[PDB]
Amino acid sequence: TKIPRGNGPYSVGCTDLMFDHTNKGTFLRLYYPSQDNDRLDTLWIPNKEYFWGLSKFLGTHWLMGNILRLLFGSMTTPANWNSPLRPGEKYPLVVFSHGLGAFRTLYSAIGIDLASHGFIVAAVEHRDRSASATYYFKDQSAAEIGDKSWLYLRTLKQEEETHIRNEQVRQRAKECSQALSLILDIDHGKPVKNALDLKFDMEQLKDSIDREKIAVIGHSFGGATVIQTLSEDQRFRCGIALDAWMFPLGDEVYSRIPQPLFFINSEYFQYPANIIKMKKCYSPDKERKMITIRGSVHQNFADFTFATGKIIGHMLKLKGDIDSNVAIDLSNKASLAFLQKHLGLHKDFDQWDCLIEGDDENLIPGTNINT
Ligand SMILES: CCN(CC)CCN(Cc1ccc(-c2ccc(C(F)(F)F)cc2)cc1)C(=O)Cn1c(SCc2ccc(F)cc2)nc(=O)c2c1CCC2
């Protein structure tokens, strides 16, 4: 309800796609330009098990599962559920990676605005036990009955945290790459039965993708995922990391990324040892940009920043000094400028080229971290 609508000229539709039905299959939330704009009725957090997951992730016990569920379980996100895809054009494609303790639906402000500008967006649900919860189906008949098998976030011991996070960011890359393949193959006529039954007939996606214009975007853990993904998959033509958390990356990725890469940071999350990994990505033969959003906290990139009031927002570290709507607008617009330059879109997004440069009252070029 407080989650912002898309600022762009397209109406936006949302749906979910699972294929195959297994735990090794692809799971994504799709945002896309809808043909019609009949009602904004997409449920934001669609299953109790996520409120269970959040609670477990956040430190809380069981009751907070229910309190969070009672507070939010009905909240909508401004997209037309299962609305038909708008026809007659090929859309550039974004694949989006959520952060630690998140899942596919918690970045709709980004997803939706992006779609309102001519993007199809596939927000993937990671099955590396980095999501709070996720689910899949043990067999085809389970999928048919809606007999979901749930997978909750894994917590790690110190000794564990270097091998595991990296094993995880490798899986996340394979999952971004795989979702890309799912879509691309649908785009070229591969018949697919969605493991979920939904009004939206997946066949509409046929011949609807501009295959030269793919980008990968993610937040935090998802930002590290952007960098691994580009590393291994040149179908992704540029990436955008929203406050990347660089710890899961091996030292080998830095020399391996040729595509242009964009760092959008928050002022209050970054720390020098994180930043120095970002600087390791810079090379005169490569395009790396970096802006910092002033007054912004880590959470400014996800949807819970528009879910509480100004006071409690700041208490829960969900909101910062900057306005949540002013922030996400800067990030979204800075992104559209960047996506236009390196995918060679023919739109008016260059009108925010300055936001790539930090030319704003609320933007800092580079980073506040002096080194
Ligand atoms: C150590 C694990 N936890 C416990 C301290 C760290 C949690 N954390 C920061 C954070 C702050 C607030 C909330 C929050 C979300 C919803 C609510 C409520 F529902 F109540 F409204 C309240 C609080 C969630 C995470 C992080 O882990 C930050 N983080 C995140 S937060 C992304 C996220 C997760 C859940 C969510 F709901 C929204 C955003 N992602 C990452 O990839 C990484 C990090 C750190 C390193 C890598």
XYZ file of C-alpha atoms and ligand atoms in Angstrom:
418
model
C 0.000 0.000 0.000
C 2.913 2.350 0.789
C 5.202 0.542 -1.674
C 5.583 3.064 -4.528
C 3.995 2.606 -7.952
C 6.202 2.546 -11.027
C 7.074 6.004 -12.293
C 7.230 4.769 -15.863
C 4.585 4.823 -18.640
C 3.850 1.054 -18.657
C 1.249 -0.677 -16.489
C 2.867 -3.463 -14.468
C 1.844 -7.075 -14.026
C 3.203 -9.655 -11.610
C 3.225 -13.457 -11.495
C 5.308 -16.431 -10.301
C 7.168 -19.060 -12.305
C 8.614 -22.374 -11.071
C 10.361 -24.801 -13.401
C 11.180 -27.451 -12.909
C 9.237 -28.220 -9.731
C 12.297 -29.521 -7.892
C 14.718 -27.973 -5.455
C 17.290 -27.792 -8.256
C 14.807 -26.044 -10.582
C 14.300 -22.296 -11.091
C 11.962 -20.195 -8.936
C 11.302 -16.572 -9.839
C 8.849 -13.695 -9.374
C 8.168 -12.011 -12.681
C 7.340 -8.300 -13.076
C 6.441 -7.134 -16.535
C 4.590 -4.542 -18.624
C 0.909 -5.451 -18.528
C -1.461 -4.703 -21.409
C -4.304 -3.635 -19.162
C -4.252 -1.869 -15.732
C -7.327 -3.215 -13.937
C -6.187 -3.488 -10.304
C -3.030 -3.376 -8.124
C -3.646 -6.571 -6.150
C -0.433 -8.646 -6.027
C 0.045 -9.990 -2.536
C 3.415 -8.844 -1.113
C 4.319 -11.793 1.117
C 2.230 -14.723 -0.146
C 2.794 -17.496 2.468
C 2.862 -17.848 6.242
C 6.180 -19.742 6.092
C 7.992 -16.541 5.045
C 6.838 -14.702 8.165
C 8.129 -17.743 9.983
C 11.360 -17.450 8.073
C 11.784 -13.724 8.652
C 11.212 -14.209 12.374
C 13.818 -17.004 12.518
C 16.250 -14.906 10.452
C 15.707 -11.731 12.448
C 16.453 -13.329 15.805
C 12.834 -13.482 16.971
C 11.176 -16.695 18.131
C 7.743 -17.914 17.012
C 5.273 -15.232 18.079
C 6.966 -12.615 15.939
C 6.243 -14.881 12.988
C 2.567 -14.318 13.793
C 2.874 -10.640 14.726
C 4.705 -9.919 11.429
C 2.133 -12.046 9.622
C -0.786 -10.264 11.314
C 0.755 -6.883 10.517
C 1.770 -7.617 6.914
C 0.164 -10.805 5.558
C -2.519 -8.890 3.672
C -0.414 -6.052 2.337
C -0.465 -5.710 -1.431
C 2.317 -4.518 -3.761
C 1.285 -2.227 -6.646
C 1.233 -4.701 -9.561
C -1.618 -6.335 -11.552
C -1.574 -10.043 -10.567
C -1.449 -12.354 -13.635
C -2.364 -9.480 -15.929
C -1.657 -10.329 -19.544
C 1.763 -9.359 -20.874
C 1.638 -6.242 -23.060
C 2.264 -7.428 -26.648
C 3.918 -6.063 -29.782
C 7.351 -5.374 -28.335
C 10.518 -7.078 -27.117
C 11.537 -6.103 -23.598
C 15.029 -5.997 -22.165
C 15.470 -8.419 -19.287
C 16.716 -8.063 -15.714
C 17.537 -11.015 -13.433
C 17.479 -9.978 -9.769
C 19.139 -11.590 -6.733
C 17.730 -11.005 -3.182
C 19.991 -10.606 -0.133
C 20.616 -12.734 2.952
C 17.409 -13.634 4.810
C 15.240 -12.338 1.960
C 13.186 -14.022 -0.779
C 11.889 -13.237 -4.259
C 9.127 -10.799 -3.263
C 10.985 -8.311 -1.050
C 12.354 -6.105 -3.832
C 9.150 -5.199 -5.661
C 9.759 -1.419 -5.438
C 12.744 -1.999 -7.705
C 11.089 -4.732 -9.719
C 7.902 -2.787 -10.334
C 9.493 0.541 -11.312
C 11.843 -1.270 -13.651
C 8.902 -2.997 -15.333
C 6.971 0.298 -15.594
C 9.822 1.371 -17.910
C 9.706 -1.522 -20.409
C 11.526 -4.203 -18.462
C 10.658 -7.769 -17.753
C 12.154 -8.566 -14.354
C 12.805 -12.028 -12.965
C 13.421 -11.874 -9.225
C 14.802 -15.293 -8.387
C 14.343 -17.182 -5.164
C 17.619 -18.629 -4.087
C 17.721 -22.226 -2.910
C 21.155 -22.009 -1.270
C 19.623 -21.706 2.216
C 20.386 -17.987 2.149
C 16.707 -17.058 1.780
C 14.694 -16.878 5.024
C 12.400 -19.506 3.612
C 11.802 -20.874 0.160
C 9.850 -23.838 -1.171
C 9.809 -26.527 -3.911
C 8.055 -29.797 -4.764
C 9.358 -33.320 -4.046
C 7.435 -34.654 -7.064
C 5.099 -33.728 -9.912
C 2.023 -34.855 -7.934
C 3.070 -32.710 -4.978
C 3.241 -29.723 -7.264
C -0.215 -30.627 -8.499
C -1.745 -30.652 -4.985
C 0.240 -27.651 -3.744
C 2.038 -29.899 -1.278
C 4.973 -27.540 -0.658
C 8.326 -28.574 0.845
C 9.889 -25.719 2.773
C 13.532 -24.794 3.065
C 14.675 -22.380 5.808
C 17.799 -20.261 6.156
C 20.939 -21.955 7.352
C 22.882 -20.295 10.201
C 26.670 -20.607 10.167
C 29.495 -21.039 12.689
C 32.593 -18.833 12.286
C 34.908 -21.565 10.944
C 32.190 -22.297 8.372
C 31.538 -18.858 7.017
C 34.251 -18.575 4.357
C 33.766 -21.882 2.516
C 29.982 -21.752 2.791
C 29.206 -18.218 1.682
C 31.386 -18.737 -1.360
C 29.894 -22.134 -2.142
C 26.634 -20.215 -1.814
C 27.468 -17.317 -4.127
C 28.494 -19.949 -6.707
C 25.091 -21.565 -6.405
C 23.427 -18.159 -6.654
C 25.238 -17.468 -9.892
C 24.188 -20.824 -11.332
C 20.617 -19.935 -10.314
C 20.695 -16.486 -11.964
C 22.196 -18.091 -15.037
C 19.591 -20.851 -14.930
C 16.609 -18.460 -14.617
C 18.018 -16.584 -17.583
C 18.015 -19.886 -19.494
C 14.493 -20.740 -18.417
C 13.172 -17.410 -19.733
C 15.306 -17.437 -22.920
C 14.119 -20.920 -23.772
C 10.480 -19.947 -23.114
C 11.122 -16.962 -25.339
C 12.081 -19.367 -28.150
C 9.138 -21.734 -27.752
C 10.138 -24.293 -25.157
C 6.844 -25.639 -23.801
C 6.841 -25.379 -20.016
C 4.335 -26.427 -17.354
C 4.653 -23.982 -14.446
C 4.824 -25.990 -11.186
C 2.292 -23.482 -9.911
C -1.227 -23.161 -11.369
C -1.824 -19.491 -12.230
C -4.031 -17.533 -14.656
C -0.982 -16.219 -16.488
C -0.313 -18.423 -19.487
C 3.473 -18.620 -19.778
C 3.173 -18.914 -23.555
C 2.745 -15.118 -23.808
C 6.466 -14.776 -23.161
C 7.229 -16.394 -26.505
C 9.212 -13.976 -28.706
C 8.935 -11.168 -26.119
C 12.552 -10.747 -24.999
C 15.312 -8.553 -26.437
C 18.047 -11.127 -26.107
C 20.962 -8.757 -26.485
C 19.870 -6.702 -23.470
C 20.163 -8.663 -20.255
C 21.318 -7.293 -16.933
C 21.796 -8.767 -13.491
C 21.017 -6.753 -10.420
C 21.029 -7.743 -6.780
C 21.117 -6.337 -3.272
C 23.778 -7.015 -0.636
C 24.452 -10.763 -0.839
C 22.707 -10.277 -4.198
C 25.262 -7.646 -5.142
C 28.055 -10.154 -4.607
C 25.902 -12.443 -6.757
C 25.864 -9.861 -9.564
C 29.658 -9.944 -9.604
C 29.935 -13.764 -9.636
C 27.244 -13.988 -12.298
C 28.927 -11.610 -14.772
C 32.140 -13.522 -14.092
C 30.766 -16.811 -15.360
C 28.065 -15.711 -17.842
C 28.564 -13.243 -20.703
C 24.881 -13.428 -21.666
C 24.631 -10.847 -18.868
C 25.828 -7.697 -20.576
C 26.144 -5.480 -17.526
C 25.431 -5.702 -13.814
C 24.249 -3.425 -11.019
C 25.157 -4.202 -7.405
C 23.008 -2.470 -4.748
C 25.262 -2.209 -1.681
C 27.113 -5.415 -2.536
C 28.452 -7.488 0.340
C 31.767 -8.603 -1.113
C 32.845 -11.187 1.476
C 31.615 -14.328 -0.414
C 33.802 -13.675 -3.477
C 37.019 -15.512 -4.204
C 39.911 -13.323 -5.309
C 39.607 -14.786 -8.779
C 36.404 -12.980 -9.844
C 37.922 -9.501 -9.985
C 40.110 -10.136 -13.008
C 37.324 -12.091 -14.749
C 34.509 -9.484 -15.243
C 34.472 -7.676 -18.600
C 30.898 -6.261 -18.573
C 30.239 -2.798 -17.223
C 29.424 -2.801 -13.472
C 27.582 -0.239 -11.328
C 27.878 0.116 -7.545
C 24.985 1.834 -5.857
C 25.819 2.029 -2.143
C 24.022 3.292 0.985
C 25.888 5.778 3.176
C 25.470 3.886 6.415
C 26.220 0.241 5.532
C 29.633 0.377 3.866
C 32.912 -0.332 5.582
C 36.482 0.004 4.268
C 37.176 -3.744 3.973
C 34.051 -4.167 1.902
C 34.811 -1.109 -0.294
C 38.394 -2.210 -1.007
C 37.006 -5.316 -2.748
C 34.851 -3.009 -4.905
C 37.930 -0.982 -5.794
C 39.618 -4.263 -6.827
C 37.105 -4.374 -9.690
C 38.327 -1.127 -11.182
C 40.542 -1.247 -14.275
C 41.219 1.411 -16.929
C 40.024 -1.077 -19.566
C 36.700 -1.425 -17.712
C 33.636 0.597 -16.830
C 32.982 0.780 -13.077
C 30.749 3.473 -11.571
C 29.863 4.107 -7.914
C 27.473 6.493 -6.177
C 26.515 6.643 -2.502
C 23.001 7.578 -1.398
C 23.161 10.153 1.369
C 21.365 9.360 4.611
C 20.509 5.879 3.397
C 20.780 2.629 5.318
C 21.221 -0.921 3.993
C 17.442 -1.508 4.041
C 16.600 1.434 1.829
C 16.937 -1.024 -1.093
C 14.295 -3.516 0.078
C 10.517 -3.247 0.509
C 10.354 -3.114 4.339
C 11.645 0.464 4.078
C 8.106 1.391 2.867
C 6.264 -0.837 5.345
C 6.490 1.025 8.686
C 6.108 4.601 9.880
C 8.913 7.160 10.014
C 9.541 6.609 13.726
C 9.463 2.803 14.011
C 11.155 2.766 10.600
C 14.232 4.411 12.093
C 14.000 2.275 15.218
C 14.082 -0.994 13.248
C 16.934 0.252 11.009
C 14.518 -0.012 8.098
C 14.520 3.687 7.226
C 17.222 6.363 7.244
C 17.496 10.161 7.264
C 16.710 10.355 3.588
C 13.107 9.682 2.615
C 12.506 6.078 1.521
C 10.797 7.309 -1.620
C 13.478 9.806 -2.441
C 16.169 7.090 -2.114
C 14.618 4.281 -4.146
C 13.841 6.861 -6.832
C 17.497 7.852 -7.088
C 18.633 4.221 -7.227
C 15.961 3.267 -9.751
C 16.668 6.314 -11.964
C 20.459 5.999 -11.667
C 19.922 2.384 -12.704
C 17.772 3.242 -15.747
C 20.419 5.704 -16.902
C 23.059 2.996 -16.505
C 20.995 0.204 -18.117
C 20.332 2.536 -21.083
C 24.018 3.254 -21.659
C 25.277 -0.309 -21.571
C 22.367 -2.165 -23.118
C 21.980 0.586 -25.670
C 18.305 1.162 -24.980
C 16.558 3.762 -27.117
C 14.655 5.619 -24.449
C 14.987 8.807 -22.417
C 16.888 7.284 -19.484
C 20.039 9.229 -20.287
C 18.085 12.109 -18.759
C 19.481 10.756 -15.445
C 23.091 10.200 -16.660
C 24.114 12.702 -14.008
C 22.834 10.334 -11.334
C 25.473 7.859 -12.507
C 27.974 10.604 -11.621
C 26.671 11.509 -8.182
C 25.431 14.877 -9.394
C 22.668 15.274 -6.818
C 21.913 16.856 -3.458
C 21.393 13.349 -2.069
C 24.124 11.552 -3.999
C 27.805 11.341 -3.215
C 30.103 10.463 -6.155
C 32.300 7.460 -5.275
C 32.103 6.636 -1.587
C 32.317 8.442 1.735
C 34.837 5.755 2.744
C 37.988 7.804 1.968
C 39.702 4.506 1.132
C 23.271 -11.624 11.824
C 21.907 -11.800 11.107
N 21.016 -10.687 11.299
C 20.702 -10.441 12.697
C 21.305 -9.160 13.250
C 21.470 -9.498 10.564
C 20.231 -8.856 9.858
N 20.601 -7.844 8.811
C 20.169 -6.414 8.895
C 18.610 -6.319 8.998
C 18.013 -5.231 9.644
C 16.623 -5.155 9.732
C 15.844 -6.175 9.139
C 14.452 -6.183 9.246
C 13.589 -6.659 8.228
C 12.199 -6.681 8.465
C 11.687 -6.241 9.719
C 10.185 -6.236 10.068
F 9.573 -7.291 9.502
F 10.120 -6.405 11.401
F 9.611 -5.080 9.670
C 12.552 -5.793 10.731
C 13.931 -5.778 10.499
C 16.433 -7.254 8.511
C 17.834 -7.325 8.429
C 21.405 -8.268 7.662
O 21.792 -9.417 7.537
C 21.782 -7.267 6.591
N 22.043 -8.033 5.359
C 21.028 -8.283 4.476
S 19.402 -7.652 4.812
C 18.348 -7.997 3.358
C 16.894 -8.188 3.865
C 16.574 -9.366 4.567
C 15.278 -9.550 5.033
C 14.300 -8.573 4.805
F 13.066 -8.771 5.257
C 14.626 -7.401 4.102
C 15.936 -7.206 3.631
N 21.254 -8.988 3.341
C 22.510 -9.477 3.067
O 22.730 -10.101 2.043
C 23.566 -9.237 3.967
C 23.296 -8.501 5.132
C 24.583 -8.368 5.981
C 25.653 -9.035 5.181
C 25.036 -9.638 3.968
